[PDB]
Design a protein around this ligand. Structure first.
Ligand SMILES: C/C(=C1/SC(=N)NC1=O)c1ccc(-c2ccc(S(N)(=O)=O)cc2)o1
Length: 279
């Protein structure tokens, strides 16, 4: 860490704290995260996971039984941009571009069976070029935090969940980009699940085989009718509703995979517009 001058505290987490920082040697501006043993082999292997849509891990520094991950630095995150554009809302060609690239990113990690596990708008970093990247990828396998984006399999006690959880999270963020409100803003675990249920219907065994046998499934969960996406994300168009729908599927094995969403007719006219930032 002695090769770094900390320019500014740019955030906070549960793993540790993040600082903008200038490399005494290279001059590079980087983001420094200040955070045992198989954490190192798991972190060092993500260093080999490079993609235009993943915030690049530049270096991992092990000293004093403290760990530091120097990442490439992007100036803004999605949550900040979203609060910034609350009165007009992100234009749809820009939402669609953001979504396309994010799914490209996830298409890549998911190939390697790496998953993010904790996507939320504060982990998605954007630049004035109109690019958007995933930050904190793979940090979870190693090693108030919101549940807003948590897939219901995780909420219901699945130990061994899959890449589909990232597709669930992405769907929630996509709904939020379009509507300008979080889709399922739970304040605790059961309110989170019960919010999911109120919109998309309590899952049963017809929509989700095996739902009733999961650890934290109770037969006594209330039973809500499903609602129409025409009421959930107006005025997103039918391609968008169709896509969103497939990304919020209860059955993790029926949920659309990133690779497959990429071929959806929603992205048929996808472009690459540049944001109006002020970062
Ligand atoms: C690299 C990195 C992060 S963020 C995170 N949760 N984990 C990281 O590694 C990073 C780089 C730049 C930023 C970042 C984050 C937030 C902001 S904000 N919304 O302007 O305060 C500006 C920049 O985070």
């Amino acid at each position: 860490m002695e090769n770094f001058q900390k320019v500014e505290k740019i955030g906070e987490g549960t793993y540790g704290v993040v600082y903008k920082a200038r490399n005494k040697l290279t001059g590079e501006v980087v983001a420094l995260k200040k955070i045992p043993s198989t954490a190192i082999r798991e972190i060092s292997l993500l260093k080999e996971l490079n993609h235009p849509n993943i915030v690049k891990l530049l270096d991992v520094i092990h000293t004093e039984n403290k760990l530091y991950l120097v990442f490439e630095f992007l100036h803004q995150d999605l949550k900040k941009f979203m609060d910034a554009s609350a009165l007009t809302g992100i234009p749809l060609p820009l939402i669609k571009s953001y979504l396309f690239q994010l799914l490209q990113g996830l298409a890549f990690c998911h190939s390697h069976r790496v998953l993010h596990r904790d996507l939320k708008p504060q982990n998605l970093l954007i630049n004035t070029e109109g690019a958007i990247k995933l930050a904190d990828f793979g940090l979870a396998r190693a090693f108030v935090v919101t549940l807003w984006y948590r897939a219901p399999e995780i909420l219901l006690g699945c130990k061994y969940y899959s890449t589909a959880v990232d597709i669930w999270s992405l769907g929630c963020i996509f709904a939020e980009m379009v509507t300008r409100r979080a889709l399922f803003p739970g304040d605790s675990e059961i309110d989170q699940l019960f919010r999911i249920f109120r919109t998309l219907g309590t899952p049963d065994e017809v929509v989700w085989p095996g739902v009733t046998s999961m650890p934290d499934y109770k037969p006594s969960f209330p039973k809500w009718a499903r609602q129409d996406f025409s009421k959930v994300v107006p005025p997103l168009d039918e391609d968008g509703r169709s896509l969103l729908s497939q990304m919020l599927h209860y059955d993790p094995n029926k949920r659309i995979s990133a690779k497959a969403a990429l071929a959806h007719p929603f992205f048929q006219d996808v472009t690459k517009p540049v944001p109006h930032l002020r970062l």
